Description:
Chain B: Belongs to the eukaryotic ribosomal protein eS4 family. Chain A is of the alpha+beta class.
Amino acid sequence: GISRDSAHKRRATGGKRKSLRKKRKFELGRPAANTKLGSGRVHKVRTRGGNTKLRALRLETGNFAWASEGVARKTRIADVVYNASNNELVRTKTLVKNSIVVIDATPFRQWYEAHYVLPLGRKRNPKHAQKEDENDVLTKKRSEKVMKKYLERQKYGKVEQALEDQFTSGRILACISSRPGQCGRSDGYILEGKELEFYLKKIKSKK
Amino acid sequence: MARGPKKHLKRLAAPKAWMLDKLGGVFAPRPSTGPHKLRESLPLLIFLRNRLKYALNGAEVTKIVMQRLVKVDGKVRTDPTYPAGYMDVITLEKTGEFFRLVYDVKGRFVIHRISAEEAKYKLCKVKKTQLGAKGVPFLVTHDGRTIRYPDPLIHANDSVQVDIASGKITDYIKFDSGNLCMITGGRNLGRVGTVVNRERHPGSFDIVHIKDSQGHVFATRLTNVFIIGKGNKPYISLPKGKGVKLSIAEERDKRLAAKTH
Amino acid sequence: MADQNERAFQKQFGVNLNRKVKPGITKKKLLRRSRDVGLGFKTPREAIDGTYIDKKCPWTGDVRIRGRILTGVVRKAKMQRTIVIRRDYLHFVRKYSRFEKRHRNMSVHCSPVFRDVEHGDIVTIGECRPLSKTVRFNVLKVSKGQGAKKSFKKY
RNA sequence: AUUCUGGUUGAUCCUGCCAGUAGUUAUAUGCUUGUCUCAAAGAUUAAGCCAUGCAUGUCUAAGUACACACGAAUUAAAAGUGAAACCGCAAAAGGCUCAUUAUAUCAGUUAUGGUUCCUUAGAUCGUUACUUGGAUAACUGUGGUAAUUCUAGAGCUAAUACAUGCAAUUAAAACAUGAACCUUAUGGGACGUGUGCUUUUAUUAGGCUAAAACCAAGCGAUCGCAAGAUCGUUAUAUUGGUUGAACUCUAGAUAACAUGCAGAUCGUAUGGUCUUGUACCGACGACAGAUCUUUCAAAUGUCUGCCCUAUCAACUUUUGAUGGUAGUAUCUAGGACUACCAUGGUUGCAACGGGUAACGGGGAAUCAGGGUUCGAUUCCGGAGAGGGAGCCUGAGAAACGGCUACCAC
RNA sequence: GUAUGUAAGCGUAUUACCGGCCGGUACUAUUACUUUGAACAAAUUAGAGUGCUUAAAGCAGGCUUCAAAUGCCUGAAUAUUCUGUGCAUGGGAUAAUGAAAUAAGACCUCUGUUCUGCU
RNA sequence: GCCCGUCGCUACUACCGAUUGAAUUAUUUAGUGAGGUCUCCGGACGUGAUCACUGUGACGUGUUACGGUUGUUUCG
RNA sequence: CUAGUCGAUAGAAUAAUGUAGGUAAGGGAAGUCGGCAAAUUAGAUCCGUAACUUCGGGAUAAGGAUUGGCUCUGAAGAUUGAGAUAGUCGCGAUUAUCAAUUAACAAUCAAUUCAGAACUGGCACGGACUUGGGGAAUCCGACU
């Protein structure tokens, strides 16, 4: 019954407002979600008229946006690394909106080698010399239009070095963008341009 | 929606445009939430009982519409307190009556008879030319008709002629300063033609300067003005004498020169 | 004043460094979308070629200017990106047939296009959504911006 | 109907009151009464306590009948009656009261591009059992109990209840991706698929003066044998609103994400079709469901208006005061709440505290004006159902002729 | 004869344009006050209409119909307490504010001797 | 003539006053905490399949068609 | 710990009364000349504080809350600045201006205090020690 009415709150001059209409249904504030990092548990609730809301708690995985080309891949959220609001939202591994998350860098690698025939990041040679089966799916040249179009493509393989390191280490920093307590998903965007320059102050330089 | 939704209507809360008795009964019809507004709608219970006088009480009327005798715009409308708003064509086919809701000279409702071919169509203002409903373009009229696929030239605040046997539009008129009009709901409600000017106040309520047939002028807002044709050229047969808004002396001579005397 | 200084990163909702694949290269000279509040007020230059974020600006934030447009002398400008204006009016009584000087002080948000507002500029405002507990308004034009006698002739 | 008379004095003229006078849907009470027409009527004191009685239920041709109660029985029609009992809906409106409550409620004015909403309305479904699953109440039967308040065990039986899903549920087509192709270019793919709805995130154009010089394709075409460089017009640098603008609407595209939805319903009245194949088909629904719109609303918000009081002048951050960023929660804005950060806000133009025999308004009383006084009370808005608190069902209730505690009785 | 209360010409932004003196446009120091409007429930009140037998009320009701009624309508106005704020518009008396003095007197401008560009 | 206090008696109304007096009403710091909402776990009985129980229908007896005061490992 | 001692007449046994120290159901001053004696409280952080007053105090008035362990987070500083940019010699070696930077700028180093937060156990946490009971009065002396 956690009411969100302003019939508390001593008014803007400081004086108290007195009684006001014992409580009302339309002001209920249901408790929090605190979506931790587990096995996809979702409880659904019933709201103002009719409609339902799917609360995440112990959420597993999300489909993130590669920002600069708009590609969405369902991927494994590893863990959280930052939160602007509260540091117990880091340590207790609560996913909320825009809290910075390490995820995978693998399902963006495999789903780009069509467009990104030079594959990112550079996978290691001393133990992965076997081929299951990349060069056949890099180009194969087809004697036909689309692998010829991959030379009309691959003029966009100019991705930043900062993502080139994380794509080699296979742990890409992505920032969540949905409200997981209110939609039951965590579908973030990969921070690339303006924030990957930023937020590594807020992780690396604060050691 | 709390403590709602207020399903009664006393007397002295209903609009006085219904010209209701004040005593006799202590409630009003409560027009049941149809395609027109609450105060903008003369409910079928008032039209039959009070000013057609065909059914004398609230029980004799529900034996009529449930006999499926009256119908508005081809739909049977057997809700006994259906809203049945303005410019509608109340077609009582037995015994061949063809009624319409048109406001008075004095702005209240009247009784109006028309022809059968006049019962084929009606005029409706448009409010919103939204885009996205069926299929891409879209148009919602004043009375709650969603005429899909209109003409593209028809922007907002025009009126179209919808032949109500179909849902097609066939005669649209542009809101411009050479046009007959009619006012629905102010001080000047029930005054006809022939607008000269809209004073475009950005944000909002650009009030519209109108000049009547007899040369007098008035003014209302844009939501009140309902265009009904070009200069001195309607598309509907106007009521008793034509919304000219007589003086307060002109009641007196007419009450004696046009009386049994 | 601020080169994007908060532990939360500041950015405008809706725009991105989108570099490679795009219909043409619509750089807009910078990736920053500004509105125009369009009630007649000239959209300020610093809202189009400026670098402030201000999610509560009407020109470049999640707001629209609706409702009533009012004015009044600015009174203090201390709290962060909001100011205190002071209306003045004249209430009138029937019994004495004489007016009376009154005043209501309405707090109003002030986006950082108006750096160096100082008491008492004449400003012009307009209602928007409730912004935080007092502020139901947003600045629109520091119109006169001129202390009449005692304020603006420098020294 | 803009009015005054007695009263201080031996006498006078004054200031001054006290008394007279008068109205009061304004309250009691005294005496009084033949008709009659309308008629306020446990508000004040005690929002104190209450016996009984009642005040909320409900069916059409049309969601379900196996009632001997039977209409009926060679119409085993069963449509009558259907009592029941599911289901469906309403019970959140009425009706009362005036305890709270002082910018609160309320009034007028404006917003919601900061929001949800049942129903009535208008668009509103070519995306492998097919017309399936069991199980249930009424009904039989057996019981418990000081308790008519309740209810267990058992035997059955239906659906527009529950649960699953196909015979067109059907793809063609549209159309991309890879792909029969092959080719230099506002050129060409046979086909696999994918194609819905709603959800969520991201990217994209998002409401638009005119000429060339010049150049990459070298397009019609030009120079030319051509390649390929020159230039050059039409269709083509073609998405809406208010048209007061990023309204993020459903629209439009792209990459994708999780969960369901996608008529197994119903009868009046039956037919065209007889090939009688029960193949091919009528109006329909009080029916059902998804989306946009409409309506009845609602909750917030805006500017202005609110009594007495200074023997109340300073207040506001215990543990939000005012603002910032981010968040969480909500239907939604928001210090509504958390986190960090800023030191702000308010007032002699009366803040803050106190008082109220304070519900606010429409309005009522009373004079010539100016006014004082009143408004518990039929209409509107608000609150409350002995007290405070809590919460289920729902579209809607912090409900009380719903439940859950505790206190009092 | 005069009168004067009349509109225009004329000590001129009696205002850039196209229309037949005339429409439509291009085009505008505020505020207070004031004029006219819009906007907003009735009931009440002010009140015109109406022989409820009169009246308080009410919102009905009239009518060669005299021997057939078909017998159309009056209606259910109108302004004030819905004061006040707020919103339009006419006016410029009164009343405050406002300019050009450590710098703006301008140029209708071919205009840039800035360059921001923009389709 | 008028007129003034003290004192005296009678009656009445307010006052200060040890008692750190009593009665009450409204807020509230701190403590204990009913009942609920949420939620980590719990998982009774009853379930679809299944190792499997075996009859007949079947198959080469077993298992299933079909049933079980079937039990069990299986697994939801 | 370093240095220094076990020297106080020793053994057996543990009666009564004692001198010294503990605990005690229920009640809590009834005991008594009189709460003598004992008991309670006590460190620290935060809240909070009355009569009266010489305005300085009263006051630690009163009355409350907190505290262990473990794993974390935040705040408080110091020396170096970092040093773009052009080329030489042969990456080595070699040669310098400043807009800004810039808060634990980037290094390096040091301090121990203060604020939080999870987890945790007769929920015993100032766990020994150290260590005010408090309040309303009267009488006397002002006070040290």
